[PDB]
Ligand binder design. Structure first.
Ligand SMILES: CO[C@H]1O[C@H](CO)[C@@H](S[C@@H]2O[C@H](CO)[C@@H](S[C@@H]3O[C@H](CO)[C@@H](S[C@@H]4O[C@H](CO)[C@@H](S[C@@H]5O[C@H](CO)[C@@H](O)[C@H](O)[C@H]5O)[C@H](O)[C@H]4O)[C@H](O)[C@H]3O)[C@H](O)[C@H]2O)[C@H](O)[C@H]1O
Ligand code: NAG
Ligand code: MG
Length: 364
């Protein structure tokens, strides 16, 4: 069915069974304290995004989630549940990363692989047109074209990232869908030297895709820990005047809008509840200590430019291993402010889950 305006308005957000199963089968059995078990059970009911970060998730997780939401809605959910899904499988993924977990390479048929992945997602979304579906498109992709074109892999991937982003925007432009392109965070694209080039890039992509109706705007702070709005700049933000996501968005939107793209935003807060964090530097993204579950997902943001506060990266799922010998080890995950020992990226990291519960704000 079609919708008008903010896709988060007028629906509930489904809390998926993948994350609920992680909490109930992996986390809770390891927790003996009654109050922490109860808190854990409660966080399993908070609706976070489900990531299609490997191709195998399309005909498994995506289908299962949409099928379960259809079932709940046909069984009388009021208001209807909507799905929250991340598209995250560009070839030569994470071009500036020390190590990437992306499965596809441009050199090994990656373009064709990705187009087929988008095409299959389109077929599934059409099948489930009755389930309003909100997408984040490709974390850690086009933000690299703003600041990392000195990296050979990024310069070599740039035309592919652009073309395949436009392909996704057009192929997934369906009446029951909303899309938000990743736009980094205040401490990446919100620095004053980066913010106008970022606006130019995203507004051009928007133009070149034909300004598809389904595109609502941009997602920020995905998998990061930034505040929405705090009174004091955290120490690791200095000297950026855009030290939180509100500052970033309020500076970024007018630039985007003058360039043709009046973007609305969604802001990850899933690991933002404690401010400042235990990061020693802003760019320390991996398994950062001193973080908490943050404000619960809602359409009732109170801010004109923000369609929703969301939980994009699901807290407790590891960002990367701390085993320095592992094939895809990323040194960020070995830093002093990264919790250890940490398992492979995407595996449950129970100590980290417990940290997030202890520091939750609002508490569970
Ligand atoms: C005055 O301003 C001038 O001086 C300033 C001081 O030097 C600098 S500040 C400087 O800015 C630069 C950017 O211009 C950054 S570097 C920047 O850091 C980003 C993170 O904060 C990363 S994005 C990060 O990338 C990760 C891979 O490296 C991925 S991990 C990926 O995650 C997914 C999701 O969880 C997972 O499934 C995958 O398995 C994982 O691989 C992560 O998600 C991303 O968030 C960016 O790439 C990097 O360029 C410096 O920190 C900062 O100090 C001013 O720039 C200058 O104007
Ligand atoms: C991706 O998964 C689909 C099924 O959803 C499969 O048909 C396809 O072969 C997979 N892609 C690659 C490159 O293996
Ligand atoms: Mg609920």
């Amino acid at each position: 069915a079609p919708y008008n305006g903010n896709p988060f308005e007028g629906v509930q957000l489904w809390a998926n069974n993948y994350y609920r199963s992680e909490v109930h089968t992996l986390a809770i059995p390891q927790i003996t304290d009654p109050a922490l078990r109860a808190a854990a059970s409660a966080v399993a009911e908070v609706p976070s995004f489900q990531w299609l970060d490997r191709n195998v998730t399309v005909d498994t997780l995506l289908v299962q989630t949409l099928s379960e939401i259809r079932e709940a809605n046909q069984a009388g959910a009021n208001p209807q549940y909507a799905a929250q899904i991340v598209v995250y499988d560009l070839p030569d993924r994470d071009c500036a990363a020390a190590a990437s977990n992306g499965e596809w390479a441009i050199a090994n048929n990656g373009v064709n692989n990705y187009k087929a992945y988008i095409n299959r997602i389109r077929e599934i979304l059409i099948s489930f047109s009755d389930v309003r579906t909100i997408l984040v498109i490709e974390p850690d992709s086009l933000a690299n074209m703003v600041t990392n074109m000195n990296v050979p892999k990024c310069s070599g991937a740039a035309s592919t990232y652009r073309e395949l982003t436009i392909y996704a925007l057009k192929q997934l432009d369906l009446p029951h869908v909303a899309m938000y392109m990743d736009a980094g965070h205040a401490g990446w694209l919100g620095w004053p030297a980066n913010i106008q080039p970022a606006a130019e890039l995203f507004a051009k992509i928007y133009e070149d895709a034909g300004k598809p109706r389904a595109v609502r705007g941009l997602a920020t702070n995905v998998a990061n820990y930034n505040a929405w709005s705090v009174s004091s700049p955290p120490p690791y933000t200095s000297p950026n005047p855009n030290y939180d996501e509100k500052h970033y968005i309020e500076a970024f939107r007018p630039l985007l809008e003058a360039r043709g793209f009046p973007a609305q935003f969604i802001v990850d807060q899933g690991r933002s509840g404690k401010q400042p964090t235990g990061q020693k530097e802003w760019g320390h993204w991996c398994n950062a200590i001193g973080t908490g579950f943050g404000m619960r997902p809602t359409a009732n943001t109170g801010h004109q430019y923000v369609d929703a506060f969301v939980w994009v990266k699901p807290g407790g799922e590891c960002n990367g291993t701390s085993d320095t010998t592992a094939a895809r080890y990323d040194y960020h995950c070995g830093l002093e402010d990264a919790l250890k020992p940490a398992p492979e990226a995407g595996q449950w990291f129970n100590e980290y889950f417990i940290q997030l519960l202890r520091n939750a704000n609002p508490p569970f």
